[PDB]
């Protein structure tokens, strides 16, 4: 009877979140010791439950279908784990991925580098895609209000500049979705501009989610699907530059009182990444379901280890005071 | 076999108490990891096991029935969880609620605001209701002595002034119920006078129980059953005024060496309230049975988190000493 | 010839304001040495000059009558004592008191506790009563502009939360009534939330008016018309909790540069309350007309006494510097 084994799992100061892409998979992982969904991917919902470009649906006057499918998926995930928070990520599609949707060829220009192209918040605040972002915000508002699921938060993927973030925030406010005590807004820390200006971005969002997969790619300026670059071992999240960027993000966000989360494959595979993150004082770690329990163990041990080490340092520090 | 799973639950520095209103429900929740009954409501016993106003029973010479029913309920609850403490709350009825009892129309005046009317300690020390309070104290004494259940403590609901508290204490002493090492007396911190003078009230009671439901109502001056006020969102226990009052109560009580408890719906629904309470250093948290286990998890995690944060602060503090 | 005796009255640092409920009574008390009307009650105007619920008049399209009667009363009071300020209090009625008006049964729900019910700013910002508050603001604007009576200020009764105060302020701004150098906005400090967060409320208002009558009731959680509670002596404004709350309000408001006033029966009857208020450094005291002159004497003496005591302390303090 595993359902009574949940409270007996090790207690961790750092929150252990879970990454979810398919809403129907929430019932498979309902017995895992996770403190919430730190990353809900709505890409699967749009691809397989909608099949249509949101702008195409707006042109055909079918906003209701898109809004209702997103609302159904998000409400299922939120109600399955209430009151644990569900951090829904906005549309993370690229232009080429957007073209895969039905009727998306008319609204998606052919881009040489969609990886660093028109995507994320830059797409949301643009007048062309603004109605689709408004549809997504309307779905989130319907989940939070019609179903009363307060535990639904949002994260803005691929945030580039502060003014774009504030424009997205005011667009959300125009839709009645306002940042508050019961509503948290996060920003993906996958762009080096966020690394350099995390303390400046913290005035607009409640916290940051470090997209280590994309953050490593952008910091190193390398793209993963290129087999040549992958063979050389570039895409190691243990890279000193990536670690320095993560440390800077954590320091700036905690100096401005913003929470820091990480949602990538780095904590799932590399224990040393987890140790470094916990030592830096990261607020939460979001991992894949199959890596939840182990992470909950590992973080706990690391915390205990830290709780020893700091004590020693304090004593040593105290020694230098008396001499 | 859940009965051997009790010792395996997470260990929390803050005591996790349980709220009980029906004595017969103690057997349903005997397998929950609670450190005691932080709030036992005798309102159900008087309403459904007595059906009669205590003053009416005194007039009819039936004090024995009221005393014996209270003693039976309290003894059942205390013996079910011995030696864990059972904090019995005295009669928390309002005048309109008192009139619901049989024969209570003759003893309860019609009040415009019973919510802030003749209730609580103000009712107990009044000569008219003093015999009923003496009956309640006699029932408590019978439980503590005839059945030898030392684990029964009392809390005074809706305490307004220090002189009324000392008059209630001397009335209890006249009945042979004296505050001591084996008997704890608490005061409900649901009136702003307790907020302002907690350090003064601490000389009379062993600890305080924060009635967050009533404390929010009195601090904000709003009454919950009014749907208009509820719709505007006034009754949020995360309100800055309520948090400041709770912090002041905790600080004053710990400055005077008195324990602090909370028995309301705030810790059951809002994790941030629990985090703030544990950070402030609250001695115990009393929640509903269905919210016990989760709270025991949450508090534990928060404690661990705090146990990290303080360490960091100490190191930072130590840094400022060397420079 | 008493009219030349006004300048010969004792000079007080603390402003001595007067409480007025009937505009026609301003001519009776025009020869009293008061520095202004610290509390103008428009309850009498609405009850006896309008007789109608403002929402009922709006439904019947008779906003002009209500606005003109309020304007006539306020203009009479302001012109009678120009340029001394007239602090008009907004509608302080309760729901039961509102039902006494003609046609008010349809707009006032039956409330169990109107004393802590839908009243004050909570009523003004609500969409249902918002047109009536707009009518009151329009009357104030007509007095300040059509008659050019700059000396008219407003106070918001029964302020609960900061967001409600800012919503009322923006509603006033939408009506052209904006806080400025020639227009002062006060908040009644009769709710314990104001006591706990006076420094936070000071960013929205020019000053605070301590409603000691209601402040004592809310701090002690007792209602005055209950004869049982009154007999026990609960409603003593010399209570330590009420004094501590008043001291906290004064300290916070003066730390944020906001003026503090008191408009209640405490300074009219208890000289020690006046002494404590003047020692705390209250900016003004508003009393009943029959208690004006005596208060003007008493405060003066107290000020002189303080002006001695502080000097002694300074000398003593200086002694500790030389030793
Ligand atoms: Mg990404
Ligand atoms: Mg209560
Ligand atoms: Mg009042």
Closest by CA to A14, choosing from A277, A319, A291, is A277
Across the interface, whether the CB atoms of C222 and B116 are under 8 A apart is answered yes
Q: Which two tokens stand for residue A60?
A: 């055909």
Ligand 1 centroid from CA A89, angstroms: 10
CA distance B66 to B55: 10
H or E stretch covering A134: helix A130-145
In contact, B11 and B33? CB cutoff 8 Å? no
Cβ–Cβ under 8 Å, residues C263 and C209: yes
Q: List the Cα angle B71/B73/B74 in 5-degree steps.
A: 65
DSSP-based three-state secondary structure for A63: helix
C-alpha to C-alpha distance for C320 and C311, rounded to whole angstroms: 14
Contact C250, C282 (CB under 8 A): yes
Q: How many CA atoms lie within 13 A of A198 on its CB side?
A: 27
- 8 A C-beta contact, residue C208 and residue C186: yes
Please check whether residue C296 is in contact with residue C302, taking contact to mean a CB–CB distance below 8 angstroms: no
Catalytic residue among C81, C88, C155, C263: C263
With 0-12 / 13-18 / 19 or more C-beta atoms within 10 angstroms meaning exposed / middle / buried, residue C218 is buried
Nearest-CA neighbor of C205 among C153, C241, C272? Answer: C153
Nearest CA in chain B to A4: B2
CA–CA distance, B56 with A136 (Å, rounded to integer)? 63
Residues of chain B neighbouring C116 (CB-CB closer than 8 A): 113, 115-116, 217-218, 221-223
How many CB atoms are located within 10 Å of the residue A25 CB?
14
Provide the b/e sequence for A39-66 (b: ≥16 CB within 10 Å).
Answer: bbbbebbbeebbebbbbbbbeeeebeeb
Per-residue tokens: B225: 């059953």
Residue closest to C246 by CA, chosen among C222, C221, C281, C270: C281
Q: Which two tokens stand for residue B282?
A: 């609250």
Q: How far is CA B295 from CA B8, B34, B113, B291, B299, in A?
A: 15, 10, 35, 6, 6
Catalytic residue among A263, A277, A292, A300: A263
Cα of B217 from ligand 2 centre, angstroms: 10
- Judging contact as 3 or more Cβ pairs under 8 Å, the answer for B and C is yes
Residue B158 phi, psi (nearest 5) = 60, 60
Resolution in A: 2.2
Contact by Cβ (8 Å): A237, A212: yes
Asked if the Cβ–Cβ distance from B315 to A317 is below 8 Å, we say yes
Q: What is the DSSP letter of A122?
A: H
CB-based contact C241:B193 (threshold 8 Å): yes
Helix (DSSP H) and strand (DSSP E) numbers for chain C: 15, 8
Are A139 and A127 contacting, i.e. CB atoms less than 8 angstroms apart?
Answer: no
What is the maximum alpha-carbon separation in chain A? Answer: 78
Beta-carbon pairs below 8 A across chains B and C: 144
Distance CA B214, CA B195 (A): 13
Q: Which two tokens stand for residue B39?
A: 């709030």
With CA atoms as reference, report the closest residue to C237 among C224, C228, C225: C224
What's the gap in Å between the CA of B244 and the closest CA on chain C? 7
Residue B168 in tokens: 């209630």
Q: Which chain C residue's Cα is nearest to B239?
A: C161
Q: Using an 8 Å Cβ cutoff, are C85 and C166 in contact?
A: no
**How large is the C-alpha radius of gyration of chain A?**
20
Give the span between the Cα atoms of A183 and A177, in whole angstroms.
Answer: 8
Identify the bridge partners of residue B153 per DSSP, sorted by sequence position. Answer: B87
Q: Pick from A197, A73, C131, A170: which is nearest to A185 by CA?
A: A170
Residues A276 and A242: beta-carbon distance below 8 Å: no
Query: CA A32 to CA A15: how far, in whole Å?
Result: 13
- Residue A285 CA to residue A300 CA, distance in Å, equals 12
| Rounded Cα gap, residues C198 and C192, in angstroms | 9
Q: In degrees to the nearest 10, what's the CA dihedral of B196, B201, B203, B208?
A: -100
The rounded distance, in Å, linking the Cα atoms of B61 and B64 is: 8
Helices (H) and strands (E) in chain A, counts: 15, 8
Taking alpha carbons only, the member of C226, C94, C215 closest to residue B95 is C226
Substitution target in B32, B270, B305, B319 with the highest count of A β-carbons within 10 Å is B305
Chains A and C touch (3+ CB pairs under 8 A): no
End-to-end CA distance of chain C: 58
Separation CA A155–CA B251 (nearest Å):
37
C-beta neighbour count of A146 within 10 angstroms:
10
Q: d(Cα C288, Cα C261) in Å, to the nearest integer?
A: 14
- B298-302: Cβ within 8 A, 24+ apart: B298/B271, B298/B274, B299/B12, B299/B13, B299/B14, B299/B16, B299/B274, B300/A11, B300/B10, B300/B11, B300/B12, B301/A11, B301/A12, B301/A13, B301/A15, B301/A35, B302/B274, B302/B275, B302/B278
Both tokens of C247, joined, read 């001291």
CA dihedral B51, B57, B62, B65 (to 10 degrees): 30
Using CB atoms, pick whichever of B220, B232, B248 lies closest to residue C193.
Answer: B220
Instruction: Please spell the DSSP secondary structure of B65-108, one letter per residue.
Output: HHHHHHHHHHHHHHHHTTTS-EEEE-----HHHHHTSBTTTTTS
**Would residue A242 show up in a list of annotated catalytic residues for this protein?**
no
DSSP, res A154:
E
For β-strands B152-156 and B86-89, DSSP reports them as: parallel
User: B153 phi and psi, to 5 degrees?
Assistant: -115, 170
User: What's the Cα-to-Cα distance from A137 to each of A41, A45, A230, A323, rounded to whole Å?
Assistant: 15, 15, 37, 60
For the four alpha carbons of A116, A122, A126 and A130, in that order, the dihedral sign comes to positive
Q: Judge whether A300 and A11 are in contact, CB under 8 Å.
A: yes
Contact A12 B308 (CB under 8 A): no
Assign B231 to helix, strand or coil: helix
Nearest CA in chain B to C214: B221
Work out the number of other CB atoms within 10 angstroms of the CB of residue B85. Answer: 20
CA distance B18 to B9: 16
Q: For A298-319, b where at least 16 C-beta lie within 10 A, e where not — what string? A: bbbebbeebeeebeeeeeebee
Contacts with B321 from chain A: Cβ below 8 Å:
321
Let me know if B322 is exposed, middle or buried by CB neighbors in 10 A (0-12, 13-18, 19+): exposed
Chain centre to alpha carbon of residue A30: 20
Got the DSSP string for C109-168?
---S-GGGSS-THHHHHSTTTHHHHHHHHHHHHHHHHTS--TTEEEEESS---HHHHHHH
Show the 3-state SS of C8-35: CCCCCCCEEEEEECCHHHHCCCCCCCCC
What are the tokens at A283? 């607020």
Residue B323: is it exposed, middle or buried by C-beta count within 10 angstroms (0-12/13-18/19+)? exposed
Asked if A307 lies within 8 A of B312 by C-beta distance, the reply is no
A322: Cβ–Cβ under 8 A, 6 or more apart, which residues? none
Residue A235: C-alpha distances to residues A160, A196, A212, A266, A276 (Å): 22, 21, 10, 10, 18
Helix axes of B240-255 and B271-280: crossing angle, nearest 10 degrees:
30
Residues of B in contact with A318 (CB under 8 A): 318
Q: Is C160 annotated as a binding residue?
A: no
Phi, psi of B88 (to 5 degrees): -80, 130
Per the DSSP assignment, residues forming a β-bridge with A46 are: none
Q: Does C122 carry a binding-site annotation?
A: no
Cα→Cα distances B318→A252, A256, B306, C13, C291, Å: 21, 22, 18, 49, 60
Strand partners, C153: C87
Chain B residues within 8 A (CB-CB) of chain C?
109, 111-113, 115-118, 122, 126, 158, 160-161, 164, 190-193, 195-197, 200, 217-223, 225-229, 232, 234, 239-241, 244-245, 248
**Residue C102 contacts residue C56 (beta carbons within 8 Å):** yes
Radius of gyration of chain C (CA): 20
Query: Is A190 known to sit in a ligand binding site?
Result: yes
Binding site annotation covers B151? no
With b meaning 16 or more CB within 10 Å and e meaning fewer, what string describes B263-288? bbbbbbbbbebbbbbbbbebbbbbbb
Does C89 belong to an annotated binding site? yes
Ligand nearest to the CA of A189: 1
Q: Which whole-number Å values give the CA distances from C125 to A174, B229, C47, C155, C193, in the listed order? A: 21, 11, 22, 15, 18
Q: According to the entry, how was the structure determined?
A: cryo-EM
Q: What would the two tokens of residue C167 be?
A: 């919503």
Closest CA to C188 of C90, C94, C116, C77: C90
Element (H, E) at A187: strand A185-188
| DSSP strand pairing (C259-263 vs A86-89) | unpaired
CA angle B126, B130, B135 (to 5 degrees): 160
């Amino acid at each position: 009877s595993p359902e009574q084994l949940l409270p007996l799992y090790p207690v961790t100061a750092t929150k252990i979140y879970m990454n979810l892409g398919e809403p129907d998979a929430i019932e498979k992982y309902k017995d895992l010791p996770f403190d919430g969904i730190g990353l809900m991917r709505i890409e699967f919902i749009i691809t397989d439950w909608v099949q249509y470009h949101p702008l195409y649906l707006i042109e055909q006057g079918k906003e209701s279908l898109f809004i209702d499918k997103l609302a159904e998926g998000i409400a299922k995930v939120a109600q399955a784990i209430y009151p644990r928070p569900v951090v829904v990520r906005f549309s993370d599609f690229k232009t080429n991925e957007y073209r895969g949707l039905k009727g998306g060829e008319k609204y998606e220009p052919e881009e040489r580098n969609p990886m660093i192209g028109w995507r994320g918040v830059s797409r949301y605040i643009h007048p062309k895609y603004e109605p689709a972002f408004r549809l997504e915000v309307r779905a989130i508002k319907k989940v939070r209000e019609e179903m009363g699921l307060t535990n639904v938060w949002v994260m803005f993927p691929f945030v580039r500049t502060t003014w774009e973030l504030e424009r997205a925030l005011k667009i959300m406010e125009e839709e009645g979705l306002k940042r508050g005590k019961d509503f948290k807004v996060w920003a993906m820390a996958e762009v080096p501009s966020i690394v350099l200006l995390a303390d400046k971005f913290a005035e607009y969002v409640d916290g940051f989610s470090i997209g280590s997969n994309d953050l490593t790619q952008l910091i190193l300026g390398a793209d993963r699907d290129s087999n040549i670059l992958a063979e050389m071992g570039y895409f190691d999240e243990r890279d000193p530059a990536v670690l320095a960027g993560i440390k800077m993000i954590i320091e700036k966000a905690h100096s401005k009182g913003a929470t820091v989360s990480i949602c990538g494959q780095a904590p799932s595979v590399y224990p040393e990444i987890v140790e470094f993150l916990v030592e830096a004082g990261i607020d939460s770690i979001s991992v894949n379901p199959d890596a939840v329990i182990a992470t909950r163990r590992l973080v706990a041990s690391i915390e205990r280890k830290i709780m020893l080490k700091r004590l020693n340092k304090i004593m040593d520090k105290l020694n230098k005071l008396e001499l």
